[PDB]
Design a protein around this ligand. Structure first.
Ligand SMILES: [Ca+2]
Length: 258
């Protein structure tokens, strides 16, 4: 029920650390509201959407195929690999690896895909190549979680808008990317918990043990996304339950005032 910026500021007062938020109109790219839009936050698992943007850009360029099968071994597994640990014999295709990285936040899926492009610094080069000179990935999973592996709310939002609506990717690749974010399985306690019946939402969350939480999302009424929302929090000693609740309440405020 309070206006959104009031609720964001309240959330920060209750939690400590910092909360960064931006709401952007999808069609025009106008910023509708924001708080700490230019300050840095840890990306956490939200990078996995940017990583699969770089893989689909390779597919558009004829350098990669979503159906290409990758075989890997027990040695390649890192912490939190719920889908990849189940395919040691059959492997996964590049498309399945992106689905696992986005919809389950599978960490070995993200590492395998980072190998296909030459590592974290090459992801950062793809971002630079599209006009985002702020966002940087420096680490492999599971140890993203200083300025390493960070973005700002306005950099991430703008970059997500460029991937989803721009002509940087083909229409089929842009649709594949939003399809995987719409199928996200692990963000149910965040924005999803405040969405009314019939709205569209495509999202990717991030968390660290550890103090941090974030979500990036494209959402809108009547089955169509019309706004991008980015929320990042870092730096507090609050519990996971408390961080999830504040995000769901900021979500309720932006819907009630849409
Ligand atoms: Ca404050």
């Amino acid at each position: 029920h309070p206006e959104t910026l009031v609720k964001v500021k309240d959330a920060e007062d209750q939690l400590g650390g910092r909360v960064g938020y931006i709401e952007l109109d999808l069609a025009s790219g106008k910023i509708l509201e924001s708080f700490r839009p230019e300050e840095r936050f840890p990306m956490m698992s939200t990078f996995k959407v940017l990583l699969c943007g770089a893989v689909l850009s390779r597919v558009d360029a004829g350098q990669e195929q979503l159906g290409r099968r990758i075989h890997y071994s027990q040695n390649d597994l890192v912490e939190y690999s719920p889908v990849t640990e189940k395919h040691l014999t059959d492997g996964m295709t590049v498309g399945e690896l992106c689905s696992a990285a986005i919809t389950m936040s599978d960490n070995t899926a993200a590492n395998l895909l980072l190998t296909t492009i030459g590592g974290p610094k090459e992801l950062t080069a793809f971002l630079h190549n599209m006009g985002d000179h702020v966002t940087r990935l420096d680490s492999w999973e599971p140890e993203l979680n200083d300025e390493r592996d960070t973005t700002t709310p306005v950099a991430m939002a703008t970059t997500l808008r460029k991937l989803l609506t721009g002509e940087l990717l083909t229409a089929a690749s842009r649709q594949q990317l939003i399809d995987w974010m719409e199928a996200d399985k692990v963000a149910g306690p965040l924005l999803r918990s405040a969405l009314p019946a019939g709205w569209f939402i495509a999202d990717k969350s991030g968390a660290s043990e550890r103090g941090s939480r974030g979500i990036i999302a494209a959402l809108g009424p009547d089955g169509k996304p019309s706004r991008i929302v980015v929320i990042y929090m870092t730096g507090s000693q609050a519990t996971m339950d408390e961080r999830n609740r504040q995000i769901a309440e900021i979500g309720a405020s932006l819907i009630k005032h849409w």
